[PDB]
PDB file of C-alpha atoms in Angstrom:
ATOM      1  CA  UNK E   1      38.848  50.732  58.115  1.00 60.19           C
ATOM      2  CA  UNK E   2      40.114  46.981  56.907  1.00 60.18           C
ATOM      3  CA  UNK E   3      42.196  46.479  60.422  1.00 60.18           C
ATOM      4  CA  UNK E   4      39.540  46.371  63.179  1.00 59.61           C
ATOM      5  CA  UNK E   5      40.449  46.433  66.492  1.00 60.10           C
ATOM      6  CA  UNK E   6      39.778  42.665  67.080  1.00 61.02           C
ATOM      7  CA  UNK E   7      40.996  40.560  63.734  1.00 65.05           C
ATOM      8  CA  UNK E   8      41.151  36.844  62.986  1.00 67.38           C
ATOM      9  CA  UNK E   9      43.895  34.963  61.142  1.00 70.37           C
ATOM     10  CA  UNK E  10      44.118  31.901  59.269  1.00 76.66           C
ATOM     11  CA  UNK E  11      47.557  30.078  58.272  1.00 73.07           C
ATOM     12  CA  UNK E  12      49.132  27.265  56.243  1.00 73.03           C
ATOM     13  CA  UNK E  13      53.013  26.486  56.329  1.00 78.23           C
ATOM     14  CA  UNK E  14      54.726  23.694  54.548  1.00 76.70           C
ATOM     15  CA  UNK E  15      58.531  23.450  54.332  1.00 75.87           C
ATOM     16  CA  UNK E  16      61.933  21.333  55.298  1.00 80.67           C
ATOM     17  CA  UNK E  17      64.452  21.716  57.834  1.00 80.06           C
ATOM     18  CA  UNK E  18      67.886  20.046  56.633  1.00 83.42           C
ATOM     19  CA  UNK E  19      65.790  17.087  54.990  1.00 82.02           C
ATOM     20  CA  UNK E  20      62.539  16.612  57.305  1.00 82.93           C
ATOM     21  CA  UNK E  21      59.249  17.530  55.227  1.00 85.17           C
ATOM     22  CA  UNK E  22      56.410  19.012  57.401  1.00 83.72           C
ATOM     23  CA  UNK E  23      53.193  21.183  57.514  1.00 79.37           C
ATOM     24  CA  UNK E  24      51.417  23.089  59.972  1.00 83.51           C
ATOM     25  CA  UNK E  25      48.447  24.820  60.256  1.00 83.14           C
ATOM     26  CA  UNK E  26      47.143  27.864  62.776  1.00 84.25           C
ATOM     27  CA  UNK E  27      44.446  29.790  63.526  1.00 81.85           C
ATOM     28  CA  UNK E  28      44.897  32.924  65.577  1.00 83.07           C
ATOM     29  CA  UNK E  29      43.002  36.626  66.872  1.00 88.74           C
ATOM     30  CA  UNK E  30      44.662  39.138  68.062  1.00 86.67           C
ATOM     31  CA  UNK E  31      44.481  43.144  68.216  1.00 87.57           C
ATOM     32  CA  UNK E  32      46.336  44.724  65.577  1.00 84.98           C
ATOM     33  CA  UNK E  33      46.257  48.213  67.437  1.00 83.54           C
ATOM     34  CA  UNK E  34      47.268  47.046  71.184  1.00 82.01           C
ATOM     35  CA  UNK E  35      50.220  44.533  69.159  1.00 78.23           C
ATOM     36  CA  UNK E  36      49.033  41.516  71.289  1.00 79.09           C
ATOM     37  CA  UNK E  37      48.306  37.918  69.213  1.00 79.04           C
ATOM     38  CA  UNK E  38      47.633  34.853  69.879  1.00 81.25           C
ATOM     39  CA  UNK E  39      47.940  31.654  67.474  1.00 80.72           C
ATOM     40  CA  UNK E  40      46.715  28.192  67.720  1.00 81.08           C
ATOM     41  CA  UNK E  41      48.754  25.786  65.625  1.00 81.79           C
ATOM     42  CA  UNK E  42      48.782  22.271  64.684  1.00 86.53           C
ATOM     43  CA  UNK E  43      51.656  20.308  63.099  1.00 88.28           C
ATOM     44  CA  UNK E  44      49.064  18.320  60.241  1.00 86.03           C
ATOM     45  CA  UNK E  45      52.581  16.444  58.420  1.00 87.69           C
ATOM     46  CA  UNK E  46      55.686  14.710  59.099  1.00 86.38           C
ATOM     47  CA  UNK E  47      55.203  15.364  62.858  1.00 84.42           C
ATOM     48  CA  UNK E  48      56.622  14.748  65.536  1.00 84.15           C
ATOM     49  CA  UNK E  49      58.993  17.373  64.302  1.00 86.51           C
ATOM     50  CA  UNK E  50      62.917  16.078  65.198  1.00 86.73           C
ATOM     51  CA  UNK E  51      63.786  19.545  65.549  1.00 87.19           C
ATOM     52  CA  UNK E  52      63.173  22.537  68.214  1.00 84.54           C
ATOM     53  CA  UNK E  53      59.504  24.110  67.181  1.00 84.83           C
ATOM     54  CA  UNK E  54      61.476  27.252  68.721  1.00 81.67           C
ATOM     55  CA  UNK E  55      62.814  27.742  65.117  1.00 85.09           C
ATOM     56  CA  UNK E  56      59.689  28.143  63.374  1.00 82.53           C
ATOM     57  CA  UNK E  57      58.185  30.722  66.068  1.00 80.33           C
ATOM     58  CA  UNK E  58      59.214  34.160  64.326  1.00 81.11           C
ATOM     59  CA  UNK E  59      57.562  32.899  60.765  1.00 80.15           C
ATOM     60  CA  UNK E  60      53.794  32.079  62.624  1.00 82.50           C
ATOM     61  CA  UNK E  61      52.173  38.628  61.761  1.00 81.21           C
ATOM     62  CA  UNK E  62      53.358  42.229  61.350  1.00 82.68           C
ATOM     63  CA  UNK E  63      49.684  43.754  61.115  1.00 80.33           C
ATOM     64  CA  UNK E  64      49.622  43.086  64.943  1.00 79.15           C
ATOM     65  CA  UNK E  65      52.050  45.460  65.844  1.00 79.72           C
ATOM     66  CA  UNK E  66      51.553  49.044  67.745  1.00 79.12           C
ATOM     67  CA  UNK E  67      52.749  51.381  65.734  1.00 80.25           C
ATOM     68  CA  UNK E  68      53.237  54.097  68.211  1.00 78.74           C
ATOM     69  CA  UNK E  69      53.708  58.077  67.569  1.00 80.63           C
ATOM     70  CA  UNK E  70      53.578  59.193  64.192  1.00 80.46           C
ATOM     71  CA  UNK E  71      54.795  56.217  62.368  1.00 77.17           C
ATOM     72  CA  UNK E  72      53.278  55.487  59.389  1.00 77.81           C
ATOM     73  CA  UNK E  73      52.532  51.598  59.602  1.00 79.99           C
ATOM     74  CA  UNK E  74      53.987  50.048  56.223  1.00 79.67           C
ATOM     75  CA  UNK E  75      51.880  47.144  57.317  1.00 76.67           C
ATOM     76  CA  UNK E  76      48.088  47.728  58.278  1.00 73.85           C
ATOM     77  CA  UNK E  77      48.463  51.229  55.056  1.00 71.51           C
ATOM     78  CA  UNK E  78      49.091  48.035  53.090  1.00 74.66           C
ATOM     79  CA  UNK E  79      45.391  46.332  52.947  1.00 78.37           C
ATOM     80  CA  UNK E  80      43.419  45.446  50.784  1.00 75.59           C
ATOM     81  CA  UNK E  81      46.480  44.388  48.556  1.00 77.81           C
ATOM     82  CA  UNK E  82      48.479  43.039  51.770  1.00 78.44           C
ATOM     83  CA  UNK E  83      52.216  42.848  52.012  1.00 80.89           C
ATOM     84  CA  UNK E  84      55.313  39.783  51.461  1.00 82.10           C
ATOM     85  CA  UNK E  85      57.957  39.589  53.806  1.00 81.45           C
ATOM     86  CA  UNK E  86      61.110  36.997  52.973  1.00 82.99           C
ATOM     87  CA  UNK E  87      63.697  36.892  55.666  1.00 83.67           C
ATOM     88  CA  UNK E  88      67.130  34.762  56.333  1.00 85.13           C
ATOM     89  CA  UNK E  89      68.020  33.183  59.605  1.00 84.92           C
ATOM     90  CA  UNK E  90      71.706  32.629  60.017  1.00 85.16           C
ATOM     91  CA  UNK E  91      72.779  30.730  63.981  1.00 84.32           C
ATOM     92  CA  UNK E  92      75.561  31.372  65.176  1.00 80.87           C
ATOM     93  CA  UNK E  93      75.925  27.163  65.174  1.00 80.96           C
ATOM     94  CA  UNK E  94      75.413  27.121  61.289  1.00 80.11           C
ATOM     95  CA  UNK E  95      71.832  26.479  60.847  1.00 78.38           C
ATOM     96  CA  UNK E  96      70.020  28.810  58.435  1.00 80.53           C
ATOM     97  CA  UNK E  97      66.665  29.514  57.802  1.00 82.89           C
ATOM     98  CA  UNK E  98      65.166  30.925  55.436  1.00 81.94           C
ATOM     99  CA  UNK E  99      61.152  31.529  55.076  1.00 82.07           C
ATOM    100  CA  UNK E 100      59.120  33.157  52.623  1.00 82.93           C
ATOM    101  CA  UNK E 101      55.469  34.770  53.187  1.00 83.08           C
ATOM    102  CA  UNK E 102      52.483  36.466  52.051  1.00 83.57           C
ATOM    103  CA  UNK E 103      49.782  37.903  53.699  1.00 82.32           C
ATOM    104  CA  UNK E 104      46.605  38.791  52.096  1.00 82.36           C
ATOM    105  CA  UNK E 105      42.862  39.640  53.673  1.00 83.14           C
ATOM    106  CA  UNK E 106      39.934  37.465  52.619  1.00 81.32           C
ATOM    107  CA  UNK E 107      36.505  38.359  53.958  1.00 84.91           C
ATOM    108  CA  UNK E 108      37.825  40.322  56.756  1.00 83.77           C
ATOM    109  CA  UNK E 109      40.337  37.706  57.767  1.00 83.17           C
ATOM    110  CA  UNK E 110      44.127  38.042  57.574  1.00 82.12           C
ATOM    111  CA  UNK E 111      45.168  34.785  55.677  1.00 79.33           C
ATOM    112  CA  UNK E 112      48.884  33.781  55.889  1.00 78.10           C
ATOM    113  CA  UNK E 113      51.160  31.917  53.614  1.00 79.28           C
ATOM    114  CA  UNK E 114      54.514  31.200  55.032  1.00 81.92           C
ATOM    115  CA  UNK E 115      57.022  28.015  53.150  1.00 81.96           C
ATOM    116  CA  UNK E 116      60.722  27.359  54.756  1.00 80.22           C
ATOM    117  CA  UNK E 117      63.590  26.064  53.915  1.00 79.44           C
ATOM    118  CA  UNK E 118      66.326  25.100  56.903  1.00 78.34           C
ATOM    119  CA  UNK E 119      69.443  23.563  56.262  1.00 80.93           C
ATOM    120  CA  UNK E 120      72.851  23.049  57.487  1.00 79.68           C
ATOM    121  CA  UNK E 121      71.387  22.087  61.487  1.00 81.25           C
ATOM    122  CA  UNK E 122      74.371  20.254  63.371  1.00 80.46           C
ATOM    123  CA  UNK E 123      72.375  16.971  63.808  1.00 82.08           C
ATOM    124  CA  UNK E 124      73.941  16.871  67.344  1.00 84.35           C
ATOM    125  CA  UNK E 125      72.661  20.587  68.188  1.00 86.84           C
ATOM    126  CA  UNK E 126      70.511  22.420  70.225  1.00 87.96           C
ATOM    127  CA  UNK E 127      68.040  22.468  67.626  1.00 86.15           C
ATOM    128  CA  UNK E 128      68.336  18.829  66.443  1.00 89.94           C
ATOM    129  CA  UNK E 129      68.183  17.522  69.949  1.00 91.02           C
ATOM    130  CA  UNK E 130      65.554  20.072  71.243  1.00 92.80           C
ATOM    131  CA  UNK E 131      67.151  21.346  73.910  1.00 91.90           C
ATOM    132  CA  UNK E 132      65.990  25.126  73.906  1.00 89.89           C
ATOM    133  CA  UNK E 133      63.921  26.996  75.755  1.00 92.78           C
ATOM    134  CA  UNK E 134      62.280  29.725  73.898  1.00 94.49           C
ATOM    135  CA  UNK E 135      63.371  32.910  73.200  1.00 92.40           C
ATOM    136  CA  UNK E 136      64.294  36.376  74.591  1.00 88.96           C
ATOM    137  CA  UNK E 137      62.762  39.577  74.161  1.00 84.38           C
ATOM    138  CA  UNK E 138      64.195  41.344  71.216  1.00 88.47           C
ATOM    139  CA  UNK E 139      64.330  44.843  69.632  1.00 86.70           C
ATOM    140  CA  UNK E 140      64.512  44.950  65.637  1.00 88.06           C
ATOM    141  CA  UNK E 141      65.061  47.368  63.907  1.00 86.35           C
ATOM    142  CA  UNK E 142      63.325  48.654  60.280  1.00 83.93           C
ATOM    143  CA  UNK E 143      64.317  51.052  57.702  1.00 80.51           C
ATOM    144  CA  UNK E 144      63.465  52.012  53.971  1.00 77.49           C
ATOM    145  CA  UNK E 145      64.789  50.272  50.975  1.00 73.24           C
ATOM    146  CA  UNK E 146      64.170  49.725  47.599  1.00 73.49           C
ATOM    147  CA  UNK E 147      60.254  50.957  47.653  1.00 71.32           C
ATOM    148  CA  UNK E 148      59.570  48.541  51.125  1.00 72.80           C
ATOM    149  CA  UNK E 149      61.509  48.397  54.119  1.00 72.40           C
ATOM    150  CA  UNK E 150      64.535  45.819  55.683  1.00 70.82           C
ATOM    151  CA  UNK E 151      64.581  44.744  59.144  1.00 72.78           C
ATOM    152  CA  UNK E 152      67.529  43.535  61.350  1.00 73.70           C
ATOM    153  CA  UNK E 153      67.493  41.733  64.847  1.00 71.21           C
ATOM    154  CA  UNK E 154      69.759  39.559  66.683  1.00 68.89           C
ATOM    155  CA  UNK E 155      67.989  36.875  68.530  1.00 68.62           C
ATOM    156  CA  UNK E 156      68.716  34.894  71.502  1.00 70.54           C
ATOM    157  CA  UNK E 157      67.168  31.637  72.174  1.00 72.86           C
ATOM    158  CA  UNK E 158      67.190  29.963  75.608  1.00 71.27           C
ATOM    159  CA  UNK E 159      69.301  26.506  75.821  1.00 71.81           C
ATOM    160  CA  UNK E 160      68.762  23.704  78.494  1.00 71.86           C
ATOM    161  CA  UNK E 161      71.202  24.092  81.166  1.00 67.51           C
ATOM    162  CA  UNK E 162      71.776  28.112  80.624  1.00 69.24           C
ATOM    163  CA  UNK E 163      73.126  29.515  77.981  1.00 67.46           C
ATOM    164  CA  UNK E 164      71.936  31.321  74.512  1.00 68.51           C
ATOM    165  CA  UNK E 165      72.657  30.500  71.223  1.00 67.64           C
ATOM    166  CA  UNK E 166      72.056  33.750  68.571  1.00 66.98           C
ATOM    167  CA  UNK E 167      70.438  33.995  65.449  1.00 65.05           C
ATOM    168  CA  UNK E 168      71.132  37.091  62.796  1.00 64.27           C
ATOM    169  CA  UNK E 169      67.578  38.115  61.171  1.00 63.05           C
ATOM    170  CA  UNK E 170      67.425  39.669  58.006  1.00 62.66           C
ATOM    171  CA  UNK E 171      64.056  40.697  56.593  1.00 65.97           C
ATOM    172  CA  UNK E 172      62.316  42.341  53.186  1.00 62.71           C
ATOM    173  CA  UNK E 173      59.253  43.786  53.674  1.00 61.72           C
ATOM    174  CA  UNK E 174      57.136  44.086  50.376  1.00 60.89           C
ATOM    175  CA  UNK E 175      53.813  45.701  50.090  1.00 59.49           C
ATOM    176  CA  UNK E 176      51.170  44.427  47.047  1.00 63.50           C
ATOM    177  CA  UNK E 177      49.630  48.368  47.453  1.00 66.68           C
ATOM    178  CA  UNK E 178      50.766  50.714  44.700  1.00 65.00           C
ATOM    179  CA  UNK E 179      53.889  53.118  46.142  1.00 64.84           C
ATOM    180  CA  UNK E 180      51.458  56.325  44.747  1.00 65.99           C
ATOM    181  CA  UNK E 181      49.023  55.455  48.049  1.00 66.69           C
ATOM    182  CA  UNK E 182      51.228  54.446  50.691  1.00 67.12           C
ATOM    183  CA  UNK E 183      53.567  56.404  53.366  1.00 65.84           C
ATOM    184  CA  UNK E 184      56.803  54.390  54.034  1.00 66.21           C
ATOM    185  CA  UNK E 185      58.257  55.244  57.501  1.00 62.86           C
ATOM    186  CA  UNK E 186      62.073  56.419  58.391  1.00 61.79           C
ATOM    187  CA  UNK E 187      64.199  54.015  60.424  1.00 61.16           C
ATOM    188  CA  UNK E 188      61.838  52.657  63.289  1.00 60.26           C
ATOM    189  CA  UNK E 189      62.273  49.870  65.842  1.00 57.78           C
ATOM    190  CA  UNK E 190      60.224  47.469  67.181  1.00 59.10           C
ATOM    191  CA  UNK E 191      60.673  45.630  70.345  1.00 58.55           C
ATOM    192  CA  UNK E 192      58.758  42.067  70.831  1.00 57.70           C
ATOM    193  CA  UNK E 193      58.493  39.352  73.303  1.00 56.73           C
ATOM    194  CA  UNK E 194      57.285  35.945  71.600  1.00 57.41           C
ATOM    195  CA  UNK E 195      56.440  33.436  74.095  1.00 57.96           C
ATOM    196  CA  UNK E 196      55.346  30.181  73.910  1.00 54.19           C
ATOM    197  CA  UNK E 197      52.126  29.149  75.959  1.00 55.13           C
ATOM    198  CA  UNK E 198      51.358  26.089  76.017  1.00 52.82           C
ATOM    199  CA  UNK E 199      52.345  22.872  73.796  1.00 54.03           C
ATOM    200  CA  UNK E 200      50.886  19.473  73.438  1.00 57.57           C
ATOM    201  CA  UNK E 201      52.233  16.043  71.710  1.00 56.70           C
ATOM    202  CA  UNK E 202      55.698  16.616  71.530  1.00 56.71           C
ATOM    203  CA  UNK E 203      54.900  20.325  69.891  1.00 55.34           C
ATOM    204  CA  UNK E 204      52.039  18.784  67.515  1.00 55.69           C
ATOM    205  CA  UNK E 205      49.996  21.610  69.499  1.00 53.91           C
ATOM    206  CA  UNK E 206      51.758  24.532  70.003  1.00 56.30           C
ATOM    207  CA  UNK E 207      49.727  27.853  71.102  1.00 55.57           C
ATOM    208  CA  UNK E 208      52.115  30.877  71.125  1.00 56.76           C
ATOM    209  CA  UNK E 209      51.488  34.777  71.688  1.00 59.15           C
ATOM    210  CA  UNK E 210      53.502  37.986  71.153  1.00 57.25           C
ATOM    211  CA  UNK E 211      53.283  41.264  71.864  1.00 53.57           C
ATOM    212  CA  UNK E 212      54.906  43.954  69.864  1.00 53.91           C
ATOM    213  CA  UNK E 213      55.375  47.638  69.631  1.00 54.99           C
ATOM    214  CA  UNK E 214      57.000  50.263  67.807  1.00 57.94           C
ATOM    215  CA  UNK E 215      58.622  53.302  68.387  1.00 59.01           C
ATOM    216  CA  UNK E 216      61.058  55.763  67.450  1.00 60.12           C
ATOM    217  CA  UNK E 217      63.696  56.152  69.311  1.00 64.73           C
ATOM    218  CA  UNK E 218      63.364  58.255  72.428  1.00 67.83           C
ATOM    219  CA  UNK E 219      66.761  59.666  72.992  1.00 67.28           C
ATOM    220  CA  UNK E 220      67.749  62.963  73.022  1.00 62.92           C
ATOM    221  CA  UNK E 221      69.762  64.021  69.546  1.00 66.75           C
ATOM    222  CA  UNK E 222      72.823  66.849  69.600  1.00 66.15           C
ATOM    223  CA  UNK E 223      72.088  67.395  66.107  1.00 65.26           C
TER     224      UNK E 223
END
């Protein structure tokens, strides 16, 4: 099948955050059935970026996720069309972030297309002044609309000195396949932990992994 157990992945970003133009590149493997990635990424324009890398992490790859149990995986069923997926992020600070993506497959690599657009940063921030620290785990959950799916997290990223500051995610998931061949899932969640490795420059050289998997919930029902 199109999603081998070892794939490669190719990416170009371009975008603002509340007025600073940059670009970024990445290039990436991973293992699509295990959920585990890791991307290699290079900030090519207006770096050094004046603003916590931290915020672009979540828009640097939903064919790398387990999809546990039965469910049918919107995601990898998607190929060789590939899928979209457009998403808001709103802080709880006022910052939002919006990004828009597609993914297609090109000679048995996934190629990624991602542009953003963040405004409304308080310029004396956590994000403007870089002082965050990654983020924690987090659990988001996915259900059917509208011939794709929607996704919903809340997000909590690490400040210097202690502390969180939370984002609100909300995601569209659009597949390119016709609906006649593909088998959208019920409500499912997935559960992630995106960490940064290593960085270089100031964030000019960022490598970062995640590892994701779905599941159903596991809880007894009443009904």
């Amino acid at each position: 099948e199109l999603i081998k157990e070892n794939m490669h992945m190719k990416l170009y970003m371009e975008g603002t955050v509340n007025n600073h133009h940059f670009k970024c590149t990445s290039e990436g493997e991973g293992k699509p059935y295990e959920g585990t990635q890791t991307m290699r990424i290079k900030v090519v324009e207006g770096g050094p970026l004046p603003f916590a890398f931290d915020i672009l992490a979540t828009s640097f790859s939903y064919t790398f996720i387990n999809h546990t149990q039965g469910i049918p995986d919107f995601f990898k069923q998607s190929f060789p069309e590939g899928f979209t997926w457009e998403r808001v992020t709103t802080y709880e600070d006022g910052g939002v972030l919006t990004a828009t993506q597609d993914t297609s497959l090109q000679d048995g690599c996934l190629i990624y297309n991602v542009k953003i657009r963040g405004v409304n940063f308080t310029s004396n921030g956590p994000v403007m002044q870089k002082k965050t620290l990654g983020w924690e785990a987090g659990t988001e959950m996915l259900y059917p609309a509208d011939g794709g799916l929607e996704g919903r997290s809340d997000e909590a990223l690490k400040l210097v000195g202690g502390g969180h500051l939370i984002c609100n995610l909300k995601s569209t998931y659009r597949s390119k396949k016709p609906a006649k061949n593909l088998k959208v899932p019920g409500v499912y969640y997935v559960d992630r932990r995106l960490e940064r490795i290593k960085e270089a420059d100031k964030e000019t050289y960022v490598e970062q992994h995640e590892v994701a998997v779905a599941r159903y919930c596991d809880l007894p029902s009443k009904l």
